[PDB]
Design a protein around this ligand. Structure first.
Ligand SMILES: CCCCCCCCCC(=O)OP(=O)(O)OC[C@H]1O[C@@H](n2cnc3c(N)ncnc32)[C@H](O)[C@@H]1O
Ligand SMILES: CCCCCCCCCC(=O)OP(=O)(O)OC[C@H]1O[C@@H](n2cnc3c(N)ncnc32)[C@H](O)[C@@H]1O
Ligand SMILES: [C][C][C][C][C][C][C][C][C]/C([O])=O/P([O])(=O)O[C][C]1O[C](N2[C]=NC3=C2N=[C]N=C3[N])[C]([O])[C]1[O]
Ligand SMILES: [Mg+2]
Ligand SMILES: [Mg+2]
Ligand SMILES: [Mg+2]
Lengths: 530, 530, 530
């Protein structure tokens, strides 16, 4: 590489060795297994770089990781990109066939796999044929990664290369039939860290990530760089606690004993943490959690606020860095009551620094920013994937019209708060009046004996589409279609006709098909009804 | 320009239209003359862009500004770069000959000059011959800039171009004989804003610039983008107060009545503000000021702290963005007494995010980071000027060894605090024991009747250099050389011989030569002694 | 495209419109469904080109075909490449998951699928998301392809483009875990036709494909361009008979009534044809069949020769055009008895024109051409795939050492006859004496009650590998391990020890795992034993 010293390159090694703050005695904690200082963390990063160089990993190679949230994962976030290699984060929650597909598609040279994921590997090990070495990670002294690090020196000269070198890659499930690989460069990750650290932390009092915080991720580190927050916490030089495999009791004990103040997780994990018996006696006053990946229920947000938790929502996807918007409350909004604060904190959020967010129709006409007009979110940001890896048509559809298409339908109010209604694929085309399936699912989710609602929508001769609803019920507490229709009626707002009782046609279904991740697979549900 | 939508360009228009926060009703205040909202600010930026397009200003053209800190200056920080033109900030405090040299060297097409600077223009107007139009700025309704803006619409489509397009340029005096022009691109300014906003604001409690702050610059806006802070305040959407021509009473009244919480100025301006009679009855508890451009005296810092001012130091130069290091205090350091806090806050500061700072010798050997070992600061950062404009040899000397040479001699302690001792050109070469002139000047500055000290140093046969000192005295309170030598003796530490009484050879001088900026011109002083 | 008229491009349109011979009244026969002349064939090719242009198919697009051997398939061999599009031949015998993987990987825009394959499509239709239109092919008047052709004119101006434009693509199963896509350009297909037509046809009397022949493929047209023979037959302007879905009675009736003289099929199809009851009364004197895809048994060749069939073997793979070698007999060899002629005709064959064939070791040392020294066949030819589509490491392994690695172990005698022993992956590493698994399988296949033999080989402490054998037996005619060992003993030649009775360790297995194609999947068999 022709390195011009005056031509600065935005590299992850600048995130590590030129941080906002660096305390060499600040601790990196891996649950109850390991503790070491930031100086030891840098030494281990250099040792891992030396080991990767010894293992034959060159610039441009792909190193795959199948591990829980640990210090090893963080050492992989830095070391693997910082030597010019591509870090492939494998979603361990995918099916073994999907994991095999991602491994073959990315063509990983080295796989760092935790010993608990060995049963997954054994199902697909014979069909990989592209990985030259497997390193088995363990939470004890017999870890192969630790032994590899021990043989290496703590000195390494990390190279200078183009900031557009691909640093991380991972595959999102979506609805494409096969996982789609998105990739991010060193420049994109550095800009993501800078922009979000300029967005949060510069807030007045609420929702700050600052140098005095103690960081504990509860979002898997294979899930879009764990929302890019491990890089941010390292850049701030804060104390980082890594819980490993998620157990609610272990998570709560780590929060209590390590004085964790900043965390991030999906709403289900927050619900599990708040519903745990031992969380009742815990002090949550100093704990801040940001909820992303799914819509934060207002009831869950209110319950968290009643525990003095600074809970606020965020939004992003695998293609977008991920962070696109974070809920930031003005001091006037912080003076509101608990219900209004829960309403504001459950929003999709205001767009973060350097992000252009618009809601558009099918023709990309940039719908007006009212609190009721819903359209597809299209974004421009410094940390968007340019395309899907080794894909053309899906890549073209992703960036149609010069904007990245999120596939999410939302309305943005006058003050800039986004509120996601549902997905684009879930739109119910009742003539010209498109309605969201999620609002009807939420309406039906308040029934006396309802368990799960999944509104599909199937073609209709007159209205084009009518919202067919699937409802699962409590055991032995059977509810008929007519009772559900009566309950759904008389609610606020409706489509085209009265309260849509003639179109809802609810059907009781034994089970709802779900993807490997856990979201409802409406594509499979359409097979059973149309 | 071939604009690839997925290839994001770091542009100032993204700073303006994609901020961290944007309150359309937030006010931009120009002292007691004008107030308007952020929406009006954006409308005026677009109107100014339209006017510049009408005036024939194309991409690559240079527009010069000779104005005080005003809303017009901010509208120039955005509009002029955001249309692809180069913003030339003219140092109005330079001599008219130097200003003429800078205007001719930069080849400005349009000059926006305040009516108070017209006497300066009239001395050099006949020798410019390169400016096609002069726009006279006034603080009333007869301002030509306001009339030009009034004729234009509030709609403009700002172009997309390479992020490496030069956005701002200005000339530093230095010691080169002629002013040297440094320039910064859109990418460099955006990265400066992002990095410093990640550095300050993410601090725990002390020295924060956050979205709830009220911003008032007391650093001239032609001085290295006013330290880049107007961009940062606009990016945060905070209330901005612009004082115009600096008057201590006006500044204090603006601080009191506009509830200013964040400011920045040179130490002399802070001393003037604290020494003003009306500052005694003012409440300074909520006011944060960062002191740059010169070393902050410990006594001044202590006096500011005794007024409950969150005062801390920063460091930079025209070539470096400018911000390279800012004093950030850990919570342990905030618990110290007033004297220790003043000692820590008066440091040069810890290097800011994405900045590599090293102290090196004449051979660039990266001296160890002890609290006593002094060397020249060499820096790498995303916001450094690549060279001097239309210069080769000085540009080569600036980036010698692959690092930007600051010309400042400093020691960096173990925890990362930089402490500038003096300039490289001011080094006294007493054999192998180089000593700083500023420490001797400070020692002699505590005399009973001393007024100003300027240690030069002239060649010596035995020791190579010996610290010749020039001392100015109080009127009619004459002090001889021997008395000054006796006072300077018996102080802590010395060079090569006892207390350097045989080498100091103090001489009483009527006046000390100073540059147009106001700093001591030791080059002229050398003419009178060697 | 910058078409220089003097710079001739080797295009398939030159194969069609500049043939060796062109009789406009020569017939193209699709079994008992359709008959039309060569003039009608050209008109239908131009109509199909017009329809594809109307359907939005541009140069570089991929059109997939799921059809039996028909006139429609041939019209696809010409029309789709001749307009600059890529013809994707889908192996309809693969599993639906593999077919879906190939469709997604190739990113087909249009799929021409026979109505009999609609059940396969319905299993994977929801997960394709990349195909814009499906054309359903039928053997009657309601065929969508025929209706599309009827709407178009018979005039088309086929473009001139680079001869290196990719014309055809298809996916081979192999042992890579996922199907690997190979592709061939217009130049490669034209050169394949020219070279093989120079190889066969220029033979003196035996094994000729000449202008007086009548052609009927019994090799699927998705299997490596049906061995490139449809192009050759079209280039010769011979009468072509296409049987559609393979039925032995239909095939024999077509051979008898259409006077078919040249055919090609796998050995299993030839065995089925010869074992059919109605083949006994048929006259096979004028019928020539070339057997490829698998080793031709000597017994089957002798049985075919006893029916006066000019049967000879050929060799190739999906990566190599496919044709690499064809059995061509000298007039002296044609005078030999039936047994010697069967021995010669069952060979892998002599390398065809413009093909470099070598047998090499693991270090690529070009083993000598003796009739006993076995090594891996590595080839250079004008019609080899340069790499696997969207693959790097498998592509690198394919062309390791500057030669295409066939993966087949063979010995080449002094006169140039190749004889494949087994695959490279099937090599038994008994110390330095590697032995072929297929020879042991053939030895054990002569047992009194044996049905299927699959020698795997599992690691051994002393000899590295020992030939573990799996044997399936006739129903209720159980045979023990010791009896099989006794039968296998006393045969000609052996490895390292006596007759390898101490290492064979035969095990009786209920069933042998097989791939979707039908070959033995020794990778799955290794899972059950090591
Ligand atoms: C938020 C933090 C703001 C602090 C940045 C201040 C930048 C000031 C740039 C400036 O004055 O530039 P010039 O080229 O005119 O002068 C550069 C020289 O000024 C001296 N300097 C600057 N800051 C200093 C501190 N904090 N202490 C001691 N000396 C300082 C240096 O000689 C520099 O080379
Ligand atoms: C006019 C002459 C026509 C003969 C060409 C036949 C080409 C068949 C291509 C094929 O079957 O390809 P695949 O990738 O599916 O399989 C390739 C592997 O098949 C085995 N093979 C092919 N021909 C063989 C003969 N004649 N004898 C023994 N084995 C054969 C090889 O393992 C090959 O790698
Ligand atoms: C700090 C801040 C943080 C936040 C961020 C988060 C991110 C996440 C990502 C994910 O999850 O991804 P994927 O897997 O691809 O997915 C995507 C999707 O999801 C959803 N979401 C998200 N987020 C949210 C949602 N919803 C609602 N709400 C919210 N917040 C959508 O659909 C997308 O697309
Ligand atoms: Mg996604
Ligand atoms: Mg300077
Ligand atoms: Mg093959």
């Amino acid at each position: 590489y022709v390195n011009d010293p005056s031509n600065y390159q935005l590299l992850i090694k600048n995130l590590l060795f030129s941080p906002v703050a660096f305390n060499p005695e600040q601790e990196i904690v891996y649950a109850n297994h390991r503790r070491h200082s930031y100086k030891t963390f840098h030494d281990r990063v250099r040792q891992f770089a030396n080991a990767l160089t010894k293992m034959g990993v060159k610039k441009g190679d792909t190193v795959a990781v199948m591990d829980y949230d640990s210090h090893r994962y963080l050492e992989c976030y830095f070391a693997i990109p910082m030597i010019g290699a591509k870090l492939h984060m494998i979603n361990v929650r995918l099916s073994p066939e999907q994991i095999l597909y991602t491994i073959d598609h990315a063509e990983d040279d080295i796989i760092l796999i935790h010993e608990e994921f060995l049963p997954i590997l054994d199902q697909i090990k014979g069909r990989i044929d592209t990985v030259t070495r497997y390193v088995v990670l363990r939470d004890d002294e017999e870890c192969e990664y630790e032994r590899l690090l021990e043989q290496e020196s703590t000195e390494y000269n990390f190279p200078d290369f183009d900031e557009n070198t691909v640093a991380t890659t991972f595959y999102t499930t979506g609805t494409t039939g096969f996982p789609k690989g998105v990739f991010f460069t060193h420049r994109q990750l550095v800009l993501h860290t800078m922009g979000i650290l300029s967005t949060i932390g510069t807030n007045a009092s609420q929702g700050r990530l600052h140098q005095g915080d103690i960081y504990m991720p509860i979002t898997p580190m294979f899930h879009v760089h764990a929302w890019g927050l491990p890089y941010m916490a390292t850049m701030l030089g804060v104390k980082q606690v890594y819980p490993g495999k998620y157990v609610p009791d272990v998570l709560l004990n780590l929060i209590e004993q390590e004085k964790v103040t900043f965390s991030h997780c999906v709403p289900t994990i927050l619900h599990l943490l708040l519903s745990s018996p031992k969380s009742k006696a815990m002090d949550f006053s100093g704990w801040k959690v940001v909820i992303g990946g799914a819509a934060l229920p207002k009831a869950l947000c209110k319950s968290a606020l009643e525990r003095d938790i600074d809970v606020f929502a965020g939004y992003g996807m695998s293609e977008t860095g991920p962070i696109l918007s974070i809920v930031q409350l003005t001091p006037e909004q912080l003076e509101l009551d608990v219900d209004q604060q829960a309403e504001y904190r459950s929003k999709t959020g205001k767009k973060v620094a350097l992000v252009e967010a618009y809601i558009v129709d099918e023709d990309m006409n940039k719908l007006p920013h009212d609190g009721e007009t819903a359209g597809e979110i299209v974004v421009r940001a410094p940390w968007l994937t340019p395309n899907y890896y080794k894909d053309n048509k899906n890549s073209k559809a992703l960036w149609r019209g010069g904007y990245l298409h999120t596939g999410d339908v939302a309305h943005i109010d006058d003050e800039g708060f986004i509120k996601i209604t549902d997905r684009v694929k879930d739109m119910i085309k009742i003539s010209g009046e498109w309605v969201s399936s999620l609002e009807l699912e939420d309406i039906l989710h308040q029934h006396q004996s309802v368990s799960e609602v999944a509104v599909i929508g199937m073609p209709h001769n007159k209205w084009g589409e009518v919202p067919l609803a699937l409802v699962t019920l409590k055991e032995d507490a059977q509810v008929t279609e007519k009772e559900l229709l009566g309950f759904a009626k008389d609610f606020i707002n409706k489509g085209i006709l009265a309260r849509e009782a003639l179109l809802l046609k609810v059907k009781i279904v034994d089970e709802i098909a779900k993807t490997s991740v856990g979201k409802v697979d409406k594509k499979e549900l359409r097979k059973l009804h149309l």
